[PDB]
């Protein structure tokens, strides 16, 4: 309903755009610093940790299954996260007190699918990938 | 208030063309309005025009053909320097075969096609097509 068009208003336009960028969600999330602090990864793509004990997250109402997550503690921070072990019978490959490398789930901050409270997945069990053990291309070292 | 006289002269010409009127009256008159109308008439978008002279700024009566499609103003008079001109006439104009951009250069009020022919930039006023 009105914006200054005049020839010496570069300061007003620039300052208003700079002031209003702070209402864009992703801009503020990326430039504030609270998300980089609250992120259980230190702003990294992957992270190694130790398995505390396996758990049985039950899926949300329109589906029914028991999703079989694990509870990991991260090396560099000491934070406790919950990670997902995706495949048919891949929870047998993960004992307790063995270090696993986990990665993100694919939405950059959010729960994917019917699983509540889970945001990461497990990609390596002990220096060997969960996709070589799932096809028999490798095996656990003991 | 009437900050800009040319803006409302051109908007009152353009509001009447959409309506089929044979004539308009526009007021106040100004030096830049008469030059812009002469440029718009040399090409054939409007007919003759008459200046009514009170002892004040005056009024103009324009004979409208049916050829004018749109005329308008660029609100701050930006500086245009013979290299911005192509990027200007790719936003304002509807094609490359017709329609003119009007700018004031140190050699008078003219169109872009004459500005490049005389190697001069200046300030943009408006356009008509």
């Amino acid at each position: 309903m009105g914006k200054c068009r005049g020839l010496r208003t570069a300061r007003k336009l620039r300052s208003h755009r700079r002031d209003q960028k702070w209402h864009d969600k992703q801009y503020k999330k990326a430039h504030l610093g609270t998300a980089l602090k609250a992120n259980p990864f230190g702003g990294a793509s992957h992270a190694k940790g130790i398995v505390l004990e396996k758990v049985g997250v039950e899926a949300k109402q329109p589906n029914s299954a028991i999703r079989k997550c694990v509870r990991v503690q991260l090396i560099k921070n000491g934070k406790k996260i919950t990670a997902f072990v995706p495949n048919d019978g891949c929870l047998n490959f993960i004992e307790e007190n063995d270090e696993v490398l986990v990665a993100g789930f694919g939405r950059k901050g959010h729960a994917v699918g019917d699983i509540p409270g889970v945001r990461f997945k497990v990609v390596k069990v002990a220096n060997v990938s969960l996709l070589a053990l799932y096809k028999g291309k490798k095996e656990r070292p003991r | 208030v009437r900050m800009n006289v040319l803006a409302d002269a051109l908007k009152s010409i353009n509001n009447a063309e959409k309506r089929g009127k044979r004539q308009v009256l526009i007021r106040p008159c100004s030096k830049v309005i008469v030059r812009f109308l002469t440029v718009m008439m040399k090409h054939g978008y409007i007919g003759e025009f008459e200046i009514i002279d009170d002892h004040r700024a005056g009024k103009i009566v324009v004979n409208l053909t049916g050829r004018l499609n749109k005329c308008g103003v660029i609100s701050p008079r930006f500086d245009v320097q013979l290299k911005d001109l192509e990027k200007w006439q790719n936003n304002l104009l509807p094609s490359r075969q017709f329609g003119f951009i009007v700018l004031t250069t140190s050699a008078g009020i003219m169109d872009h096609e004459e500005a490049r022919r005389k190697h001069t930039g200046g300030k943009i006023l408006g356009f008509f097509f």
Partner: protein, 108 residues
């Protein structure tokens, strides 16, 4: 309880019933008390209470009220959790009591 619900599989009741016993990693239990969200508190007929979850197959098709005999399948990794697999009626509960299946601490 009566309703306009003539729709749905109409009538799943009969005077005949056949027993089902325990298996590998599968125990009996007694409902201790009712919770929300379809959950439940139970008590395995020997040890732990082992809070249970009513599985997707039983939801609103076979109801479970407090203080009844049930057959639950234990989880290997977790211990305190289990899933309600089957319900035992009064006659079948007493039958199990006769066959000596359940340690006779809970009665019908």
């Amino acid at each position: 309880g009566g309703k306009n619900r003539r729709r749905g599989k109409n009538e799943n009741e009969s005077e005949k019933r056949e027993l089902v016993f325990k298996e590998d990693g599968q125990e009996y239990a007694q409902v201790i008390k009712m919770l929300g969200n379809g959950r439940l508190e139970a008590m395995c007929f020997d040890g732990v209470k082992r809070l249970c979850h009513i599985r997707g197959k039983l939801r609103k098709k076979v109801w479970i009220n407090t203080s009844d005999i049930i057959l639950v399948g234990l989880r290997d990794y977790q211990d305190n959790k289990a899933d309600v697999i089957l319900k035992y009626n009064a006659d079948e509960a007493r039958s199990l009591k006769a066959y000596g299946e359940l340690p006779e601490h809970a009665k019908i």
